[PDB]
């Protein structure tokens, strides 16, 4: 199909690599391929250079590190449940301070997990993603005092877990007080420790008035800086003896030790730019010659006083400004955890150094590496930022890799986050998508990086702008932070141009986020593209400018949940971003160089490049994703085909010829239908099922283990007692089901016997599951690379696949936020059809449009009708694309085709068509006085056709909107949710039914359901729910026996949870006793607890 | 809606009393195997299956229909429960 | 709910609590439309 594209904005630069936020960050953190002599001082090299040298005499000094090659490949790690990692080696030197005896050694420090090419990790055989974290940048900030107007508070903030927050405030009495570790005390003593006299303070702060007079205190000043140090220590640590060296060490570690206090590089930059000073290091004060010298305290005092005095050029700080908020990527978080592990390693090394014969001490002997593995493994297995990777489709993984989270260790809490931190700031423009966020308790706390945004080395998000000089737009692109952006007037990207000169007297622009109208001379920068305002997911919604932001949010989120289909198609109307999305997800296969195709197979492609070098690409076939979807690559080339560089070789999942293909293009009519599309329900045709539309493949994995027990080992075998061969048919001679067998609920997958003289503990198909057995894996003890748990002899995995067709109860959605479950599947003869006999595939209720205000789907439907009759596809970029007149012209051509087809064959206008035209003439849709063909063309240009009812053959009394729509199947399928239970397992303590479908659990009858039952006055039903069905053990047993025997259920008794409550109240030394009508004790324990 | 639900609601001073009476009559019917009913065979509630028409197995339907017939007496302290139970066994083994 | 005198034994306290609480959960200051001492806080205060 021919592709026609709209839009006039020409983009100067392409999109950056969409996963570079992960890949580049981890590459910079590791620095694996850089020779050690030229390694920079960032990443784990910085951690090594900061932890070392170790001094306590003996000294341990770091020289270099190296990373070895991974012991196992990625596929082996996935199959054997290993972590894809590389060994880490450090070259160290043990040096005697006086002797100079050098002992050099290469030490194995352990393994560091390796990021794959697409930007994910393989941890214990599972794919994981580290989510970037947004937090307040370190530095010096000034905020208004909430209690007292006219007063300001200064704050110094280091990196998380790298020092205490320090507060400065001018008290009402005039004495400036600094809070650190929840201790108000005057700052003058610290100023005295830093070596400041009366004259120095008077000269440096004289201009600002009475604040310095109120700061002054002669009692502190008359003392020596040493006495001030001891006084400060005893004020900060009441009770601790005021030793000089102990106080020195404490104060040095509080604000002056680089190993404890650390303003980051971003914090240093922020402090330097705010205070207009140059910092020597990253700490608040320097320690030299047994003395403290200030670095930040005097500049922050000067800024605070000048702010309080209203001196021009000093402002307050916005806490949510994106120049004040930064992003920690995977590399920085991993480096922080590595630094913590290195601190533990150094502490242990010092402990071992202060012990043992100094002659027998070698570098290898001093280092115990275990805490390092503890830290890295805990980060990569237990951190909330380390998440089970979402791979329903390639777009799901791409979205997951670009997520920004305000939660996590050292972040916000879900339940107590206020509106301020969840609001779209004006600086989010071009850096954070204002649309894509999760609904619910996480709204505003998890967001997405904008399409063109890039996180800089300091952690600030930058966005690109074109430089304009003298009203002429140039091709120079500058990436700027929010602070730099605040200084200019930036024109909108849709500013009309002639050549590259601004051809408009009035230009819409932004100044510090305020929309303004300016002359072309005043313009300083221009936007690169509208695409840069929204994320990747939101950029895939055509006609986004006609959609309400809430439904755009819904559609952007729901595009991630789409399931790959065996006959997936790319949308008829695209935004022009699908090819880049599929390319950057690493799902498809592309030619590395120009060449010729040598071999094509269902699982293999051999390509002969011009250099005579043959390259073989295996194809990933029917692989179970984390969400159960099947991901396979299908060849798109033939033997002997000429391939250029970058040419597509194989399509990945949810891909059609290199375009993102999340669903199907279907013919839809917008009309009510017999109440079957009532309240967002959807009606579909059986003809969709006939051609395998919306058919997906899903794979489930079942695990069993044969282990060692004290009463005898368990054994996987075919020989099981007390079952006929009808239940033993498909298991092979090793007791494992054969490949190709169809399995139903209750069928055996793996046979197992356990000692009791043996009993059946086999693995069977759970209810509501099954399919075709496609894979079997057996792992035993001793095979290379296998690391089983102690006691476990062997493990068996069975992979079973199902081909799921569309059925009633499945969820479908379009890209504009319209979602609904299929409520009815009609036969083809009942569906509404066009006058040429073509039936529609989907019927959507028009009542979902007016209140949701997503008009993009209507325009998409009109363009889809035009494309359906013209046999072409369209590219409609967001905010710059197809408009109504162009759609009308395309529909005019489509109608000429659509009616010439009927006119050539010798057919006029139908009688039913004439009656519909008269009714529409009453409705004002067609102009009176024209021929029927003119009025039909009039209706067609509005996207409406005459439609016939399949049940009667009579037309629908009014013209109906009909056209092509792109609709995707969502993973929420009724097959995975339908669950029921009569009786089953119970909890250990409360003796109540378990929860969850996997556990065969029961539904929870919570507090509000009990309230509803009470409001109905249904005492007996509620008593049944409380006792006979949940935890009245004898009661439920008697009820089941009575029902099985045909009687009525007996009277209930006291639930076991009340007995548990009584026993737990007795454990708190409280005598809880149940009494009869005469206040005599009544024993609810039947005498089992009475001596 | 249940047939004659308005009549049943109007036959009692409290709707919960109607529920109690219906439940107790249903229990009485279930205990004696429908031998104590006040319905004559042509008014018996019927159920349709492949085999043919049979008696309706649901006792609540029987009790509600019987209450519609008006041949049942309900109230407070009509008969001691022990005597009622003994007589029910004696009349209907 | 029946347009008739209430029957003796009705749990009117639970009914009253639900009747007050239900509208507050959804319709009080449902999806708000961004287009050209109040609400629930005032009710909770009272």
């Amino acid at each position: 199909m021919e592709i026609k594209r709209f839009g006039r904005i020409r983009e100067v630069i392409p999109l950056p690599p969409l996963t570079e936020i992960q890949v580049e960050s981890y590459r910079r953190a590791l620095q694996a391929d850089v020779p050690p002599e030229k390694r920079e001082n960032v990443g784990i090299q910085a951690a090594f250079r900061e932890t070392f040298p170790i001094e306590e005499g003996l000294v341990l000094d770091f020289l270099e590190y190296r990373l070895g090659e991974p012991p196992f490949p990625q596929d082996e790690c996935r199959e054997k449940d290993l972590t894809y990692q590389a060994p880490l080696y450090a070259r160290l030197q043990l040096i005697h301070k006086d002797t100079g005896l050098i002992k050099e050694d290469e030490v194995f420090l352990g393994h560091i997990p390796l990021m794959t090419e697409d930007g994910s990790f393989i941890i214990n055989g599972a794919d994981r993603v580290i989510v970037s974290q947004i937090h307040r940048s370190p530095g010096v900030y000034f905020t208004p005092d909430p209690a007292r107007p006219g007063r300001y508070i200064a704050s110094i903030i280091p990196l998380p877990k790298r020092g205490p927050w320090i507060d400065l405030e001018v008290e009402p009495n005039g004495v400036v007080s600094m809070k650190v570790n929840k201790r108000k005390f005057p700052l003058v003593l610290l100023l005295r420790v830093l070596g400041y006299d009366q004259e120095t303070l008077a000269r440096e702060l004289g201009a600002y008035g009475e604040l310095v007079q109120g700061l002054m205190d002669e009692s502190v000043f008359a003392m020596r800086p040493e006495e001030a140090l001891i006084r400060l220590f005893t004020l900060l640590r009441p009770g601790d003896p005021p030793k000089r060296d102990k106080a020195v060490a404490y104060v040095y570690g509080l604000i002056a030790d680089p190993r404890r206090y650390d303003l980051g590089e971003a914090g240093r930059y922020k402090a330097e730019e705010k205070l207009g000073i140059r910092l020597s290091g990253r700490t608040l004060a320097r320690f030299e010659d047994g003395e403290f010298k200030d670095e930040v305290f005097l500049p922050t005092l000067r800024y605070l006083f000048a702010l309080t005095a209203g001196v021009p050029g000093h402002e307050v700080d916005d806490i949510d400004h994106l120049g004040n908020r930064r992003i920690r990527t995977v590399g920085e978080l991993m480096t922080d955890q590595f630094r913590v592990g290195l601190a533990r390693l150094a502490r242990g090394v010092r402990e071992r150094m202060l012990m043992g014969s100094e002659d027998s001490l070698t570098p290898a002997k001093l280092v115990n590496s275990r805490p390092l593995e503890a830290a890295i493994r805990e980060f990569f297995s237990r951190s909330q930022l380390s998440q089970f990777k979402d791979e329903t489709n390639p777009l799901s993984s791409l979205r997951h890799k670009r997520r920004i989270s305000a939660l996590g260790p050292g972040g916000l809490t879900r339940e107590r986050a206020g509106f301020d931190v969840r609001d779209v700031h004006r600086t989010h423009y071009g850096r954070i998508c204002p649309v894509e966020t999760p609904e619910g308790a996480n709204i505003g706390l998890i967001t997405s990086l904008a399409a063109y945004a890039r996180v800089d080395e300091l952690g600030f998000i930058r966005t690109p702008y074109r430089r304009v000089v003298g009203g002429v737009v140039t091709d120079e692109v500058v990436y700027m932070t929010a602070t730099e952006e605040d200084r200019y007037t930036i024109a909108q990207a849709n500013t009309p141009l002639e050549g590259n000169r601004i051809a408009a007297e009035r230009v819409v622009a932004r100044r510090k986020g305020e929309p303004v109208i300016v002359s072309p001379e005043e313009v300083e920068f221009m936007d690169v593209s509208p695409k840069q305002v929204f994320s990747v997911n939101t950029n895939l919604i055509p006609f986004l400018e006609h959609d309400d932001a809430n439904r755009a949010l819904m559609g952007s989120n729901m595009q991630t949940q789409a399931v790959p289909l065996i006959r997936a198609q790319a949308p008829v109307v695209m935004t022009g971003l699908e090819e880049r999305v599929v390319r950057d997800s690493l799902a498809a296969l592309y030619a590395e160089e120009d060449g010729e195709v040598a071999k094509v197979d269902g699982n293999r492609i051999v390509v002969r490049y011009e250099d005579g070098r043959l390259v073989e690409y295996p194809l990933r076939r029917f692989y179970r994703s984390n969400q159960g979807t099947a991901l396979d690559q299908r060849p798109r080339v033939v033997v002997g085909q000429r391939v250029r560089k970058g040419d597509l070789l194989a399509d990945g999942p949810a891909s059609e010829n290199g375009f993102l293909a999340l669903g199907q293009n279907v013919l839809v009519a917008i009309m009510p239908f017999d109440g079957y599309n009532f309240e967002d329900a959807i009606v579909i045709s059986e003809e969709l099922l006939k051609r395998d539309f919306y058919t997906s493949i899903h794979i489930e994995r079942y695990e069993i283990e044969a282990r060692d027990t004290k009463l005898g080992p368990e054994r996987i075998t075919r020989d099981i007692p007390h079952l006929s061969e009808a239940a033993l048919r498909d298991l092979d001679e090793e007791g494992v089901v054969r490949i190709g067998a169809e399995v139903k609920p209750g069928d055996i997958l793996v046979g197992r016997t356990s000692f009791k003289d043996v009993k059946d503990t086999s693995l069977r198909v759970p209810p509501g599951e099954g399919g075709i057995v496609v894979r079997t894996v057996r792992l035993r003890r001793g095979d290379p690379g296998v690391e089983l748990k102690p006691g476990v002899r062997e493990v068996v995995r069975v992979y079973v696949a199902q081909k799921r067709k569309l059925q009633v109860g499945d969820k479908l959605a379009n890209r504009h936020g319209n979602k609904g479950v299929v409520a009815k599947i009609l036969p083809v003869e009942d569906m509404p059809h066009l006058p040429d006999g073509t039936p529609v595939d989907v019927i959507l209720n028009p009542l979902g449009v007016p209140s949701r205000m997503n008009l993009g789907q209507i325009l998409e439907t009109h363009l889809g009708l035009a494309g359906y009759f013209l046999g072409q596809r369209y590219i409609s970029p967001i905010f710059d694309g197809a408009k109504e007149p162009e759609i009308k012209e395309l529909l005019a051509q489509a109608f000429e085709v659509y009616f010439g087809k009927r006119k050539g064959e010798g057919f006029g206008v139908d009688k039913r068509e004439v009656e519909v035209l008269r009714r529409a003439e009453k409705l004002g849709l067609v102009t009176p006085g024209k021929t029927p063909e003119e009025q039909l063309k009039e209706l067609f240009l509005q996207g409406k056709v005459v439609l016939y009812d399949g049940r009667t053959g009579e037309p629908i009394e009014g013209p109906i909107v009909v056209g092509q729509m792109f609709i995707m199947k969502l993973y929420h399928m009724v097959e995975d949710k339908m669950h029921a239970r009569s009786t089953g397992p119970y909890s250990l303590i409360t003796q109540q039914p378990l929860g969850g479908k996997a556990q065969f659990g029961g539904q929870r009858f919570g507090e509000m359901e009990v309230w509803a039952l009470e409001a109905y006055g249904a005492a007996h039903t509620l008593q049944e729910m409380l006792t006979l069905k949940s935890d009245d053990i004898e009661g439920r047993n008697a009820a089941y026996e009575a029902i099985i025997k045909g009687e009525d259920v007996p009277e209930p008794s006291v639930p076991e949870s009340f007995r548990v409550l009584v026993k737990e109240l007795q454990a708190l030394a409280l005598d809880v006793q149940t009494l009869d009508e005469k206040d005599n004790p009544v024993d609810i324990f039947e005498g089992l607890a009475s001596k | 809606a249940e047939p004659g639900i308005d009549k049943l609601f109007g036959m009692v001073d409290s709707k919960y009393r109607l529920t109690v009476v219906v439940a107790k009559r249903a229990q009485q019917l279930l205990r004696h195997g429908f031998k104590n009913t006040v319905l004559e065979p042509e008014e018996r509630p019927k159920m349709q299956t492949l085999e043919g028409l049979f008696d309706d197995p649901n006792a609540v339907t029987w009790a509600m229909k019987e209450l519609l017939t008006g041949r049942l007496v309900f109230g407070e302290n009509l008969v001691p429960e022990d005597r009622l139970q003994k007589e029910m066994e004696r009349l209907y083994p | 709910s029946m347009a008739r005198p209430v029957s003796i034994g009705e749990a009117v306290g639970i009914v009253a609590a639900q009747s007050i609480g239900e509208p507050g959960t959804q319709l009080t200051m449902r999806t708000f439309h961004t287009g050209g001492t109040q609400g629930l806080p005032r009710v909770i205060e009272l």
Binding site: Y1016, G1017, A1019 | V38, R71, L78, L84 | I8, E10
Partner: peptide, 29 residues
């Protein structure tokens, strides 16, 4: 103690005409 669990209604008895009379015939003795 509400609805069918209320003391106002939960002690109600139900009996047919046949059983009611003979219980009196026992008391009439």
């Amino acid at each position: 103690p509400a609805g069918t669990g209320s003391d106002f209604v939960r002690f109600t008895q139900v009996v047919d005409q046949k059983t009611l009379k003979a219980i009196e015939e026992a008391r009439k003795e």
